[PDB]
Design an enzyme around this catalytic site. Structure first.
Site, PDB file in Angstrom:
ATOM      1  CG  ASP A  17      65.997  78.897  73.197  1.00 28.01           C
ATOM      2  OD1 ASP A  17      65.841  78.392  74.309  1.00 28.01           O
ATOM      3  OD2 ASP A  17      66.060  80.146  72.976  1.00 28.01           O
ATOM      4  NE  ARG A  31      69.283  78.947  75.214  1.00 30.86           N
ATOM      5  CZ  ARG A  31      69.308  79.806  74.192  1.00 30.86           C
ATOM      6  NH1 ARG A  31      69.529  79.382  72.936  1.00 30.86           N
ATOM      7  NH2 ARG A  31      68.977  81.072  74.400  1.00 30.86           N
ATOM      8  CG  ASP A  36      67.603  84.619  74.140  1.00 31.26           C
ATOM      9  OD1 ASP A  36      66.844  83.768  74.628  1.00 31.26           O
ATOM     10  OD2 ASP A  36      68.123  85.562  74.834  1.00 31.26           O
ATOM     11  CB  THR A  37      62.989  84.520  73.997  1.00 28.63           C
ATOM     12  OG1 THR A  37      62.711  83.118  74.057  1.00 28.63           O
ATOM     13  CG2 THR A  37      61.676  85.304  74.244  1.00 28.63           C
ATOM     14  CD  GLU A  39      68.115  92.606  76.526  1.00 31.24           C
ATOM     15  OE1 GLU A  39      68.288  93.319  75.468  1.00 31.24           O
ATOM     16  OE2 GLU A  39      68.743  92.746  77.618  1.00 31.24           O
ATOM     17  NE  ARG A  77      71.604  76.090  79.271  1.00 31.39           N
ATOM     18  CZ  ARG A  77      70.921  77.180  78.924  1.00 31.39           C
ATOM     19  NH1 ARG A  77      69.604  77.193  79.002  1.00 31.39           N
ATOM     20  NH2 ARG A  77      71.587  78.294  78.570  1.00 31.39           N
TER      21      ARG A  77
HETATM   22  C1  LIG Z   1      73.022  80.209  73.629  1.00 30.42           C
HETATM   23  C2  LIG Z   1      74.052  80.443  74.732  1.00 30.42           C
HETATM   24  C3  LIG Z   1      73.711  80.777  76.009  1.00 30.42           C
HETATM   25  N1  LIG Z   1      74.628  80.997  77.034  1.00 30.42           N
HETATM   26  C4  LIG Z   1      74.248  81.424  78.387  1.00 30.42           C
HETATM   27  C5  LIG Z   1      74.102  82.944  78.416  1.00 30.42           C
HETATM   28  C6  LIG Z   1      72.968  83.171  79.364  1.00 30.42           C
HETATM   29  O1  LIG Z   1      73.568  83.274  80.701  1.00 30.42           O
HETATM   30  P1  LIG Z   1      72.722  83.843  81.896  1.00 30.42           P
HETATM   31  O2  LIG Z   1      71.760  82.754  82.282  1.00 30.42           O
HETATM   32  O3  LIG Z   1      73.783  84.020  82.948  1.00 30.42           O
HETATM   33  O4  LIG Z   1      71.964  85.014  81.344  1.00 30.42           O
HETATM   34  C7  LIG Z   1      72.068  81.951  79.251  1.00 30.42           C
HETATM   35  C8  LIG Z   1      70.881  82.128  78.395  1.00 30.42           C
HETATM   36  O5  LIG Z   1      70.208  80.867  78.233  1.00 30.42           O
HETATM   37  P2  LIG Z   1      68.628  80.811  78.204  1.00 30.42           P
HETATM   38  O6  LIG Z   1      68.193  81.784  77.116  1.00 30.42           O
HETATM   39  O7  LIG Z   1      68.341  79.378  77.866  1.00 30.42           O
HETATM   40  O8  LIG Z   1      68.053  81.238  79.574  1.00 30.42           O
HETATM   41  O9  LIG Z   1      72.943  80.981  78.684  1.00 30.42           O
HETATM   42  C9  LIG Z   1      75.958  80.841  76.686  1.00 30.42           C
HETATM   43  O10 LIG Z   1      76.825  81.027  77.601  1.00 30.42           O
HETATM   44  N2  LIG Z   1      76.337  80.469  75.462  1.00 30.42           N
HETATM   45  C10 LIG Z   1      75.471  80.293  74.427  1.00 30.42           C
HETATM   46  O11 LIG Z   1      75.909  80.055  73.333  1.00 30.42           O
HETATM   47 CA   LIG Z   2      64.489  79.174  76.069  1.00 34.22          CA
END
Ligand SMILES: Cc1cn([C@H]2C[C@H](OP(=O)(O)O)[C@@H](COP(=O)(O)O)O2)c(=O)[nH]c1=O
Ligand SMILES: [Ca+2]
Length: 131
Positions: A17, A31, A36-37, A39, A77
């Site tokens: 993703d 992103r 998401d993968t 949890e 991102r």
């Molecule tokens: C998909 C997405 C992720 N994120 C943030 C939440 C997560 O924060 P934290 O890193 O602080 O957990 C992280 C997850 O991305 P990844 O799944 O790419 O690691 O990206 C957003 O803020 N908005 C979004 O729409």
């Molecule tokens: Ca990923």
């Protein structure tokens, strides 16, 4: 009002993703919205990565579609729906049970029902992450 698609070029597929695209003439990490993968299980991480990679690499045309909320996350991102020859990667991952619906926030939830529809089928099929 509907969203709009903008052109982009692949630089490199990163994982299930995340993709790095040349967008408006500049390299940018994207992103995918709404996915998401699981949890607590990354069994399908490599398959998801390979899938996204095949989809974006084989595409003649990649398009970026931002939603109506935040365009970038706390890391800078880009947050978008990504299309490969008109096929939504985000939707494809979910219908295949490779990633689940996640990070669903007002403004950036235009395709929420669409992705939930795909997820419901994957779930019914006990497919991949839903096995
Ligand atoms: C998909 C997405 C992720 N994120 C943030 C939440 C997560 O924060 P934290 O890193 O602080 O957990 C992280 C997850 O991305 P990844 O799944 O790419 O690691 O990206 C957003 O803020 N908005 C979004 O729409
Ligand atoms: Ca990923």
């Amino acid at each position: 009002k509907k969203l709009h698609k903008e052109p982009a070029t692949l630089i490199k597929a990163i994982d299930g993703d995340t993709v790095k695209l040349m967008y408006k003439g500049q390299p940018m990490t994207f992103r995918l919205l709404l996915v998401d993968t699981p949890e607590f299980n990354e069994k399908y991480g490599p398959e998801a990565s390979a899938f996204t990679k095949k989809m974006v690499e084989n595409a003649k045309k990649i398009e970026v579609e931002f939603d109506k909320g935040q365009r970038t996350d706390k890391y800078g991102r880009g947050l978008a729906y990504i299309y490969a020859d008109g096929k939504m990667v985000n939707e494809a991952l979910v219908r295949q049970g490779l990633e689940k619906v996640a990070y669903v926030y007002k403004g950036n939830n235009t395709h929420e029902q669409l992705l939930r529809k795909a997820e419901a089928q994957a779930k019914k099929e006990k497919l991949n992450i839903w096995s």
